[PDB]
Amino acid sequence: ASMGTLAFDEYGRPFLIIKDQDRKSRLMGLEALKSHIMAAKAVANTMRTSLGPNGLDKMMVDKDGDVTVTNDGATIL
Amino acid sequence: MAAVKTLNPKAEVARAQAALAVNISAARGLQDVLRTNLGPKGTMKMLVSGAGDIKLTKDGNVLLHEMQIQHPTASLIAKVATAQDDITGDGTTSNVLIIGELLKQAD
Amino acid sequence: MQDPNADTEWNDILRKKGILPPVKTYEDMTLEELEDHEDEFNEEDERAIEMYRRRRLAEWKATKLKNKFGEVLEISGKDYVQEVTKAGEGLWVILHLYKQGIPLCALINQHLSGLARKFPDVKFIKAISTTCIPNYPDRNLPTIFVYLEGDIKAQFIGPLVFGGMNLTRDELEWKLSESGAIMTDLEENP
Amino acid sequence: ALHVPKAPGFAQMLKEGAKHFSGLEEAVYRNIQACKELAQTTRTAYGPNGMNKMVINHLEKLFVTNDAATILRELEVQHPAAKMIVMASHMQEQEVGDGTNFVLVFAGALLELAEELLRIGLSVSEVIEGYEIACRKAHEILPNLVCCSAKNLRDIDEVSSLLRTSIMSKQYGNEVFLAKLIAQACVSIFPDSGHFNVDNIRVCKILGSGISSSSVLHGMVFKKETEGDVTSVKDAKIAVYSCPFDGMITETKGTVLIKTAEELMNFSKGEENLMDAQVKAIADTGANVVVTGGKVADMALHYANKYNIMLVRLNSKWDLRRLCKTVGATALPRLTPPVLEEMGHCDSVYLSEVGDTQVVVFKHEKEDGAISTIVLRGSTDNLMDDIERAVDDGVNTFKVLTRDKRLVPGGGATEIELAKQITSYGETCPGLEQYAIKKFAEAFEAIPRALAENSGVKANEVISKLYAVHQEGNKNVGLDIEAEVPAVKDMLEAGILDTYLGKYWAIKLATNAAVTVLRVDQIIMAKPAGGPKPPSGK
Amino acid sequence: LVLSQNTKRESGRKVQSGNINAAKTIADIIRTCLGPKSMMKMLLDPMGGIVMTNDGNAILREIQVQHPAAKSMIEISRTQDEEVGDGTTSVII
Amino acid sequence: AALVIDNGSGMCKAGFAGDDAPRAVFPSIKDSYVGDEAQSKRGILTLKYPIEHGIVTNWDDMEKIWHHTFYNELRVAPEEHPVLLTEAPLNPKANREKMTQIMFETFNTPAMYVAIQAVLSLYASGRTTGIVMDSGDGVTHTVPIYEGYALPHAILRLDLAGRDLTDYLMKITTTAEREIVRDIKEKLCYVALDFEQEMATALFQPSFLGMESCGIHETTFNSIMKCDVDIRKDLYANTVLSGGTTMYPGIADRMQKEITALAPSTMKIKIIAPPERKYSVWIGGSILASLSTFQQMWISKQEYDESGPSIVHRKCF
Amino acid sequence: PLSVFGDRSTGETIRSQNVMAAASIANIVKSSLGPVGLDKMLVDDIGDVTITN
Amino acid sequence: MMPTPVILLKEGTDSSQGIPQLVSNISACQVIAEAVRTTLGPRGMDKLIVDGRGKATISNDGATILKLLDVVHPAAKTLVDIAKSQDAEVGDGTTSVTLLAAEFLKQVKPYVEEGLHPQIIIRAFRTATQLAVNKIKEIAVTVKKADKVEQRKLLEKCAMTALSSKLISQQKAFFAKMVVDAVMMLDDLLQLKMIGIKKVQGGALEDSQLVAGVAFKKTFSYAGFEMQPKKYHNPKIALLNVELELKAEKDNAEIRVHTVEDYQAIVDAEWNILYDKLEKIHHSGAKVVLSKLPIGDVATQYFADRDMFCAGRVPEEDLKRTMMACGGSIQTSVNALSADVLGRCQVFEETQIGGERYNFFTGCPKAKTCTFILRGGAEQFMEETERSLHDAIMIVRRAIKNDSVVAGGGAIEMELSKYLRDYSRTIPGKQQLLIGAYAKALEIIPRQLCDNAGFDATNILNKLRARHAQGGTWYGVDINNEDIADNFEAFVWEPAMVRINALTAASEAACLIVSVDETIKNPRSTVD
Ligand SMILES: Nc1ncnc2c1ncn2[C@@H]1O[C@H](COP(=O)(O)OP(=O)(O)O)[C@@H](O)[C@H]1O
Ligand SMILES: Nc1ncnc2c1ncn2[C@@H]1O[C@H](COP(=O)(O)OP(=O)(O)O)[C@@H](O)[C@H]1O
Ligand SMILES: Nc1ncnc2c1ncn2[C@@H]1O[C@H](COP(=O)(O)OP(=O)(O)O)[C@@H](O)[C@H]1O
Ligand SMILES: Nc1ncnc2c1ncn2[C@@H]1O[C@H](COP(=O)(O)OP(=O)(O)O)[C@@H](O)[C@H]1O
Numbered sequence A: 001a002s003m004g005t006l007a008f009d010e011y012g013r014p015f016l017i018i019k020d021q022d023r024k025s026r027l028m029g030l031e032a033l034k035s036h037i038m039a040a041k042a043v044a045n046t047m048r049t050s051l052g053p054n055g056l057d058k059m060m061v062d063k064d065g066d067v068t069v070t071n072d073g074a075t076i077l
Numbered sequence B: 001m002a003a004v005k006t007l008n009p010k011a012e013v014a015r016a017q018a019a020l021a022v023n024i025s026a027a028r029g030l031q032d033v034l035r036t037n038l039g040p041k042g043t044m045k046m047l048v049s050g051a052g053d054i055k056l057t058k059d060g061n062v063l064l065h066e067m068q069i070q071h072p073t074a075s076l077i078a079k080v081a082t083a084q085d086d087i088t089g090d091g092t093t094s095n096v097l098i099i100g101e102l103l104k105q106a107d
Numbered sequence C: 001m002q003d004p005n006a007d008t009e010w011n012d013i014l015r016k017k018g019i020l021p022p023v024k025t026y027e028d029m030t031l032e033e034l035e036d037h038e039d040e041f042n043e044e045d046e047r048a049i050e051m052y053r054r055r056r057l058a059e060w061k062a063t064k065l066k067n068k069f070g071e072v073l074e075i076s077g078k079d080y081v082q083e084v085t086k087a088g089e090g091l092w093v094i095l096h097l098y099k100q101g102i103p104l105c106a107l108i109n110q111h112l113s114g115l116a117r118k119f120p121d122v123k124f125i126k127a128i129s130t131t132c133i134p135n136y137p138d139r140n141l142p143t144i145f146v147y148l149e150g151d152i153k154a155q156f157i158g159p160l161v162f163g164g165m166n167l168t169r170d171e172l173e174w175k176l177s178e179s180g181a182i183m184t185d186l187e188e189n190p
Numbered sequence D: 001a002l003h004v005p006k007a008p009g010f011a012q013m014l015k016e017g018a019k020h021f022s023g024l025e026e027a028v029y030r031n032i033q034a035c036k037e038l039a040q041t042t043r044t045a046y047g048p049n050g051m052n053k054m055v056i057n058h059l060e061k062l063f064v065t066n067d068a069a070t071i072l073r074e075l076e077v078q079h080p081a082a083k084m085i086v087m088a089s090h091m092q093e094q095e096v097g098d099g100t101n102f103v104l105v106f107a108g109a110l111l112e113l114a115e116e117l118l119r120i121g122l123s124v125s126e127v128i129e130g131y132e133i134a135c136r137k138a139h140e141i142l143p144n145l146v147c148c149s150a151k152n153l154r155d156i157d158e159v160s161s162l163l164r165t166s167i168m169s170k171q172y173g174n175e176v177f178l179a180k181l182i183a184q185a186c187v188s189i190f191p192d193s194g195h196f197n198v199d200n201i202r203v204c205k206i207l208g209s210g211i212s213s214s215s216v217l218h219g220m221v222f223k224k225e226t227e228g229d230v231t232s233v234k235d236a237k238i239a240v241y242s243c244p245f246d247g248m249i250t251e252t253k254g255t256v257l258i259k260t261a262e263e264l265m266n267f268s269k270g271e272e273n274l275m276d277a278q279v280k281a282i283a284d285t286g287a288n289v290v291v292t293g294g295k296v297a298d299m300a301l302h303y304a305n306k307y308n309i310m311l312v313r314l315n316s317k318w319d320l321r322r323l324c325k326t327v328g329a330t331a332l333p334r335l336t337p338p339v340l341e342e343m344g345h346c347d348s349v350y351l352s353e354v355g356d357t358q359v360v361v362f363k364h365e366k367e368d369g370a371i372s373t374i375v376l377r378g379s380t381d382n383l384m385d386d387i388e389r390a391v392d393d394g395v396n397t398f399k400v401l402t403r404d405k406r407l408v409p410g411g412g413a414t415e416i417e418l419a420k421q422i423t424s425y426g427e428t429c430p431g432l433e434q435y436a437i438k439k440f441a442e443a444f445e446a447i448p449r450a451l452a453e454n455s456g457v458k459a460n461e462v463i464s465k466l467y468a469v470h471q472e473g474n475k476n477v478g479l480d481i482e483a484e485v486p487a488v489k490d491m492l493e494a495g496i497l498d499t500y501l502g503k504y505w506a507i508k509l510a511t512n513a514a515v516t517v518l519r520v521d522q523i524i525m526a527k528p529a530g531g532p533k534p535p536s537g538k
Numbered sequence E: 001l002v003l004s005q006n007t008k009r010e011s012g013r014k015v016q017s018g019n020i021n022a023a024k025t026i027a028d029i030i031r032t033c034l035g036p037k038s039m040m041k042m043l044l045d046p047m048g049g050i051v052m053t054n055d056g057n058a059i060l061r062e063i064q065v066q067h068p069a070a071k072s073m074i075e076i077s078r079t080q081d082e083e084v085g086d087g088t089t090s091v092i093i
Numbered sequence F: 001a002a003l004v005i006d007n008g009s010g011m012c013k014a015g016f017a018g019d020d021a022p023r024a025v026f027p028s029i030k031d032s033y034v035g036d037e038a039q040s041k042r043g044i045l046t047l048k049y050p051i052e053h054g055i056v057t058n059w060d061d062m063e064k065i066w067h068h069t070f071y072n073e074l075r076v077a078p079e080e081h082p083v084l085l086t087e088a089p090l091n092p093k094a095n096r097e098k099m100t101q102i103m104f105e106t107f108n109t110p111a112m113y114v115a116i117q118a119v120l121s122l123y124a125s126g127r128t129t130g131i132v133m134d135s136g137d138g139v140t141h142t143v144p145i146y147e148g149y150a151l152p153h154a155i156l157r158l159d160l161a162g163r164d165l166t167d168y169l170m171k172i173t174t175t176a177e178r179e180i181v182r183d184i185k186e187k188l189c190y191v192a193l194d195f196e197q198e199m200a201t202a203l204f205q206p207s208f209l210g211m212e213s214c215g216i217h218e219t220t221f222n223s224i225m226k227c228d229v230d231i232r233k234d235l236y237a238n239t240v241l242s243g244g245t246t247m248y249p250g251i252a253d254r255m256q257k258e259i260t261a262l263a264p265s266t267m268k269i270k271i272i273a274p275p276e277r278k279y280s281v282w283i284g285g286s287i288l289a290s291l292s293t294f295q296q297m298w299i300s301k302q303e304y305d306e307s308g309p310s311i312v313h314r315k316c317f
Numbered sequence G: 001p002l003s004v005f006g007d008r009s010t011g012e013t014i015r016s017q018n019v020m021a022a023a024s025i026a027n028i029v030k031s032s033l034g035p036v037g038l039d040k041m042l043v044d045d046i047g048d049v050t051i052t053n
Numbered sequence H: 001m002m003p004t005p006v007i008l009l010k011e012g013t014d015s016s017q018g019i020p021q022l023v024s025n026i027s028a029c030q031v032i033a034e035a036v037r038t039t040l041g042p043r044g045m046d047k048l049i050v051d052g053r054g055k056a057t058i059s060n061d062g063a064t065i066l067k068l069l070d071v072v073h074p075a076a077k078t079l080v081d082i083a084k085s086q087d088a089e090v091g092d093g094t095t096s097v098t099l100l101a102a103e104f105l106k107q108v109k110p111y112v113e114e115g116l117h118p119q120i121i122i123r124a125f126r127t128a129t130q131l132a133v134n135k136i137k138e139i140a141v142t143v144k145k146a147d148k149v150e151q152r153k154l155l156e157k158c159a160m161t162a163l164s165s166k167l168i169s170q171q172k173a174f175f176a177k178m179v180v181d182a183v184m185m186l187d188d189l190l191q192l193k194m195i196g197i198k199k200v201q202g203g204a205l206e207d208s209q210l211v212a213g214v215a216f217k218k219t220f221s222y223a224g225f226e227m228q229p230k231k232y233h234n235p236k237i238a239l240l241n242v243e244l245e246l247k248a249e250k251d252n253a254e255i256r257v258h259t260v261e262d263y264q265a266i267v268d269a270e271w272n273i274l275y276d277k278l279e280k281i282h283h284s285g286a287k288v289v290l291s292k293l294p295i296g297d298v299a300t301q302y303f304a305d306r307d308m309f310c311a312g313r314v315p316e317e318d319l320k321r322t323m324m325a326c327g328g329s330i331q332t333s334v335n336a337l338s339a340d341v342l343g344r345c346q347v348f349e350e351t352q353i354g355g356e357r358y359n360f361f362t363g364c365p366k367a368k369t370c371t372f373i374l375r376g377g378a379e380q381f382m383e384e385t386e387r388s389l390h391d392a393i394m395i396v397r398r399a400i401k402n403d404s405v406v407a408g409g410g411a412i413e414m415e416l417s418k419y420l421r422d423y424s425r426t427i428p429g430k431q432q433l434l435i436g437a438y439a440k441a442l443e444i445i446p447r448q449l450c451d452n453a454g455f456d457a458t459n460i461l462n463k464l465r466a467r468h469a470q471g472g473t474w475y476g477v478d479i480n481n482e483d484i485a486d487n488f489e490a491f492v493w494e495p496a497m498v499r500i501n502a503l504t505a506a507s508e509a510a511c512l513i514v515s516v517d518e519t520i521k522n523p524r525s526t527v528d
């Protein structure tokens, strides 16, 4: 379910198809969909508390340490 | 580089002329060392072990076993001299000299 | 490096510039071994062999003096302090805390009975745990304590850490030599 | 006594990483073994049933081919004797264009048999004597084995039938189509004069439509676009300039020295008026197409668009020279309007899109010209490169036929007849030379042996059949590829023929290579360099 | 993976020619020690010893190899020496 | 041995092959004894250095210098030692013919070779393939090198060196004060990945200075794209920088980033620019003169006698 | 999500792997089948040799 | 083998030889096919690949997917090559080509494993390919009426089919109209550079649009650009290659004066040069000005005061499209600005499109150009939309040049499998197996459609084999019904050249891969 292809040969000889196939990863099928959905759900559940008049803000800190307090979803993301 | 080195890559080999050269060179080296032992006008050699012990000798067998040598031909000649000494007690220096000179005159 | 480091002169120049970093003797033979040959040794050797034989004889007589007991014995709790905490100075003590009930304890005791005769220098004792320690837990046997000069040197405790019912008279011997008490001549085989 | 020391002399004075081999055992047999490994590396590609190989070079580039010389170039042959055999094979490729795999096979076979003879007790000198005398006999014999001749190289059916053999070994499945294409191209070229130039056959590889979409074009194709607004022209009056399409400037240095507001106001207008005059003179000579080997200026392009001239820019100088030969023009180093002789003409010049590629086509309608192009379509760049190699083989065969029109039977017929006749010659020669002559003869058997092995049949059955039929008197009989079982047939009546010159040079070069490899007795390799490669070869 | 990382496997005409070449090499080692005009070899044991001989089995016994075909040829020589006590070079050749 | 004279538009930096440092840095390198051992050198001490911007102006001067970098600061004879001279990239043929006439005719050198300074710089770093960005005091050069030779067709030449660099800084006039600006140029001048985030807390772009040709990263990218598509990987991944100009700002990562941007998303570009041995060209020349392929590349004295300026130009016109 | 301390193959991947393994094992021995089959050497990482069909 | 004191090739040369090498090549090709299988058909999915730079690409296009995979296997590179070749010559079928090639290889794998000579296999492949190609050309439907309404219907259906696999299928009828409207405006070469595709993030797919004219993004305006007007109702348009700003009259130009009157004359001369250019541009009647080169702030304010529009730094392609649309010529000189060279449109505007400002030239009736403006919620969303439209556009062009249509859903694949099975049952028996294998391989397209859809491909292929043997040639997979159907009546139309080139390319790839009997990798030089 990861690590690209892994057989290396039914004859014992090296099987190199993709560059850095050993360092590369891959997700296929329904598990990929479920990963996508979890990622999206995490982002959306982060944002949903900044929604409406009683919505709260988020304090974003950049690489150089500047602070930005905001309720704007575009600025947050 | 040869037949033996294709099967055992870490093999050392001296063939025909090279082997003769190796052996005769070692014999001539032993002779050059021992030439001075022969006779009463010869010179005494001092031999210091790895421990520091001192040996004063003019004896061919003693000098052979005490010299610091790692040659196969020298091993052969040392054993011949050791047999000479074990059976007769004398004749080791002359043994080495005649061996070396036979090899030289044959070369 | 830019090129593969192999038997080439370019790498060698780079290396030079600073880039591409680049039966032995009668001394050991025992009393039995010395007898084995006797004739082999040259007389000149035999002169120093006399001294080495006297040395080995002295060492063997010393060990004879040291082999006080050579047998397993049982001590009660009451005299434990004298037998273990105050044993002979420098004398290795091995105490087997055990109840006769547990069969693994009996196996360990049989193995200790063998090792006692095998190792007459080490002191081998056995004792009922309930009678040595006030309320020693039932499921905590056999307990092999290794003592020296009253100090605990090792403690193989438990019916599981000791080495299972398959424990022959060999792996226990090694476990006891782990702390350097009985000093066997082998390795941990099983 | 646990180390053998290097013997006094050369063994000790030799450098650290250097190697020294001497004698039959350390040198001759090792060289023969290396050449044998080479011949084995390239044997399975010999003939129409030869299989392709996928060689990846040090730059990770891929070559898929059964062209021996290509495989050898792209292999990193490091043994010097094999290097020498490859040098011979490349000389064959240079002189003739086809037959490199014959050179390899034959040299490897001669060297194997020479090793055999040295083992039975012959000296390298006697082996060389016998090999040379037998090569002389082979050259004396070959002229008599010639069966056919071309008899016409202006035809297209005869020329196609003649090129079919050379382009069959490569690209076996489709050999009538390619032979037709190469015959069309070759006969458009090849003027009334007996000289034929192979660089005048251009090959344009465009991708995506299968090889059967390949075509011949009496003209030129450039994977370029047009610089201006005009894209088509029906009566091209091409003007060719080696200079840019811009105002000429000084070779020393130029500075616009202004000293009055008037000069400043008038300089730029004067520049554009000058450009307008230049391009209008060019347009007024009648030129509707201008092809410049240099750059194009924005103002000059403006005015070329204004006067309806198609502008084409060829970065290369060889492309410009070949276009000049194509259209009958002269590259002018100045932007001066061309004279009636300096101008070139084409029945059409247009911008098209062959596949994904945009191309500028200079197309004549006449079935002639100085240059012809073969547009190769194909689904893979590697496939198209292999077909280009097949085209090169066919074109070099056409040139060999312009040089020498004689033909010998193929499919191993010439080789079997040579083997037979040289064996019959060696049986008469007494002395120690007969052994080497008979081995030189038997070496020819390696060719039909390789053909049989690659067809998928028993080489011994094939060779026995060929020997039997050639004893009955048939010198044009060779093996049949179209047979699941060992079979043989008339190479002539089938039309499978090789070039007298091809065989001549292949035998000569293979024999010289083997004899050269044998003459070596001592090898003194130096420690491998890290040097930035040979300076001259760049 | 399926087989161990240290597991290599060769197959085909390569193996055959390799075994035959190893055998031919073993034969070339002692080819000159055959007959009444043979010459001696001074082999160096790993114990610092020396063995001067023209005996096929002595030579092939003091050599060690890693190719299994060469191992088979040395075992040939051993078998011949144990059975009949002569022919240790003729058999190899 | 082989004398390796590294002109390098610097000093003479001459010596022998095998030495890790030159032995004859003449420009800006006893008394009361007897003889002419100071006067003869006192003459040269105040002689103008011929090479300007990487090009020889006065040849008599250069010849007198070489002669004084052979007989005085090396105390050797050129009639028996091969010489390796260095030339700037895209150096006119005429200068080559002149120096080859000087060496073979005046100094009677048995054999000599002229190498490109960027190629020797790459050699001193241990590699044989890559694209060298050499930016010194007067010129900027991108030299693609494959198999150890400077491809003579992909040498893109733009001009943004120490002078052109310190120019805008001066803008932000007198010799001493523009040399205060140049002292700041000599000192830390950290390259900015993004001038936005670098000026916030306060060559790549021609408009910055005022030029209208190309950046140095564009120059490297196009010099790599005018080479073989297979060696493209090596050019992109072995970009080696040299020159005190480019060292002063220490520009590695800004280049790397925008070159990665320009290149396809395949080749990984790594720039090795930390050496600063202050004799890179000399060490590269020494490596070459130590090799045996240098004997291979020798323009010999006999070759010179037989061909002349044609042998210096290596034919192939 | 699982958090198992190991790797997991599932579906066509593991089936293809199993078939690849079995095929590998069978191709080892396919060449040793029938009157025309040939033997194999096996070297035990120490020079211990075993010839067998 | 033996050490051999000196080796033939360079140390590190990896040589794979024989039947194992061939089977490994086939397996690598199978891997490459698997990498794109699930993108096939209306139920196909997109793939997300990520580069070293960290930029993600999301695509249903097989050519794109395989270009992004860093395939290095020498035999598996061939499938990538044939997908590229298909994208080049046709523009659709890139996944089908790879599937077909890999399936040919898979089908012949058993015979290869048992020592069948590859030449026999390539002969069979060549034969069956020629047969199937001639059969496609034979049964392809080519309406011989040249009616315009039917020729627009045909293109719309072919485009809808080419688009019924993308993320724009739920608006594919929409997009199909536009694609046809797009290619029906191109003149005779159908240049793709003549169709502009702008991607304006923000908005829905239905908010996307086609402009029968030209449109391009605002270009680095100077001060005074907001003083300019932004709508013109019959403008004449000056298209130029002219830098309009105070500049050095030439870079090698040096002024030398020795008088302050000459100094002032020179200053005023530069100003008069510029103002003269601007005055010529103004008197040509042009109310809109576009320059391929910069237009400085002075010129910007000049045109703002004359109530004209100016845009500089316009990209060359957008200028050429403006030319082909408005009907003028691009001028490097302003000295002859005749109405002959000026362009004209019915409306010029500058509007806001999703955060960006865009100039629209609309109303050009003589327009040989169109500009797609694509909306969407992501860079990659719009990029895959563009790729889908590129497929549809290339399809429509090929159909325009040859309106010879076959049916899809595997209808043509099943018909060719039938025809080749029949043909194979009439030949000796060695080629019989291989041509039957070709036939069995052709069935991978409907099988993969059914797989990606979630059906029982076996039952559906049984239905199809039966219905194609009973009489019936355009029966294929009906996806929404999980059944079969006459796809030619359902309007699943596909230009014949698509499948023709797919078979040709796949067969060539298979023949190539199968002809290789040895692979020799030299060790990498400049190791690093
Ligand atoms: N006084 C002497 N005068 C001449 N020759 C002598 C004298 N004494 C011994 N020799 C000879 O010198 C030779 C070498 O003597 P020595 O070194 O003892 O023998 P070896 O070489 O075996 O050790 C003997 O052959 C002996 O005959
Ligand atoms: N149809 C055929 N039948 C038999 N042999 C053929 C046929 N076509 C070519 N050959 C033979 O193949 C050999 C040349 O094949 P090729 O692989 O190109 O080798 P070379 O590179 O030496 O020409 C010649 O011996 C030629 O006679
Ligand atoms: N004087 C001789 N002349 C010719 N052949 C001989 C002579 N002596 C022995 N042979 C033969 O030559 C071979 C010599 O055998 P040898 O070198 O001892 O090796 P081995 O006997 O171990 O094979 C034997 O076949 C022997 O019969
Ligand atoms: N609505 C549909 N119903 C059934 N089959 C379809 C439909 N649309 C397309 N197809 C089929 O799907 C295949 C298209 O494959 P796809 O991956 O979409 O593009 P490509 O042509 O690049 O493979 C063709 O065989 C086509 O006939």
Ligand SMILES: [Mg+2]
Residues within 6 Å of the ligand: D098, D099, D166, D169, D393
């Ligand atoms: Mg040929």
Ligand SMILES: [Mg+2]
Residues within 6 Å of the ligand: H092, H093, H161, H162, H163, H165, H391
């Ligand atoms: Mg499609």
